Amino acid sequence: SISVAVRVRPFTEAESNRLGLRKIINVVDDRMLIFDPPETNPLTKMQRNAEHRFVFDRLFDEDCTQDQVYRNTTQPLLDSVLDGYNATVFAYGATGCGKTHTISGTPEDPGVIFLTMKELYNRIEELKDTKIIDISLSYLEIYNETIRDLLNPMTQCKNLVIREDANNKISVSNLSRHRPNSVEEVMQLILEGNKNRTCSPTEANATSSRSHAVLQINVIQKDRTGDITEEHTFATLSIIDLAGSERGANINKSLLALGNCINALCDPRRRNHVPYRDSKLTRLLKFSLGGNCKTVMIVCVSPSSQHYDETLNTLKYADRAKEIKTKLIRN
Ligand SMILES: Nc1ncnc2c1ncn2[C@@H]1O[C@H](COP(=O)(O)OP(=O)(O)O)[C@@H](O)[C@H]1O
Ligand SMILES: [Mg+2]
């Protein structure tokens, strides 16, 4: 049960000033776009006579708002999370296409993490009469199959081990957890943590395109009007700003393994043989992908014709997150 959305980042000012470029995607409606689309002036098309069609669960064009992306991706998940089920939201795509803008955003235009925390704080506050709710978050990096605490950068990578604990809960040893008293501090914590991500080998103040950033929100709740019990619910909402998708084995082991696991989940014959074990990222999300965990991937693409190749790749990647139409072969 994997949901795929596409978000086309807007042009920059120079990009729009060179329109030599041309818009390589036409967002027809809320569910279908056209890649490499035909030429929109009837006369000009007639002169040219002298494309790929894509349907996804939800489309966001250059001018969509952060609130529009949030309400149509992760807000519908919150109920699951408060009912005790895990939920997961990815930002996939090539570097420069708006992954970090969508997940983290800016203090002026906050992204999915921020708005998720805002709505969750409100929800906690409304159901305070009947529920005891503990809300906490952590924010880690997977780079070159090494785990770093983006909110406690002084803990040694070897001390951050993925543990499958009791029940069916994946955890990370010695990973710090934080209870921001407010939304302002949620954003502060996002920004500091992003500042802690691995630098690009090239220039500076440049997060490496190979950095996975995994935010995790742990929601635990318990009945307040019953008697003293051990019944609780405990769910994890994972919001991931993935490494860049553009073209040692451990550099992009996690990205490739996420791809392979999505393949397996979309194929009914191998959906029970998902290779979560093949990387840090997929191991961390062993109980945070399959049908059980509501999973939505936000594919982020560039409208610029300059990015034809990568964008097409990305779209085709999104296109193969669709369930395979198998046949019930007999004998
Ligand atoms: N929807 C958007 N609206 C305005 N600016 C955007 C949008 N998406 C991306 N940007 C800008 O484009 C640049 C690249 O975005 P970023 O999120 O860093 O891409 P990625 O994280 O995929 O490398 C950033 O400076 C960001 O501010
Ligand atoms: Mg980024």
Q: Which amino acid is at 53?
A: R
Please check if 111 is assigned to a binding site. Answer: no
Q: Are 46 and 71 in contact (CB under 8 A)?
A: no
Q: In this structure, which ligand is nearest to the CA of 141? A: 2
- In this structure, the dihedral spanned by the alpha carbons of residues 182, 188, 190 and 192, taken in order and rounded to 10 degrees, is -150
Q: Tell me the C-alpha distance between 76 and 60, whole Å.
A: 17
Residue 318 annotated as binding site: no
Q: Distance, CA 230 to ligand 2 centroid (Å)?
A: 41
Q: In whole angstroms, what is the distance from residue 232 CA to residue 108 CA? A: 37
Q: Is 3 annotated as a binding residue?
A: no
- Measured from the Cα of 103, ligand 1's closest atom is 17
Q: For the range 193-201, what are the long-range contacts, defined as Cβ-Cβ under 8 Å and sequence gap of 24 or more?
A: 193/139, 193/150, 193/151, 194/100, 194/104, 194/150, 196/141, 196/148, 196/150, 196/151, 196/153, 197/141, 197/143, 197/150, 198/141, 198/143, 198/148
CB 179 within 8 A of CB 133: no
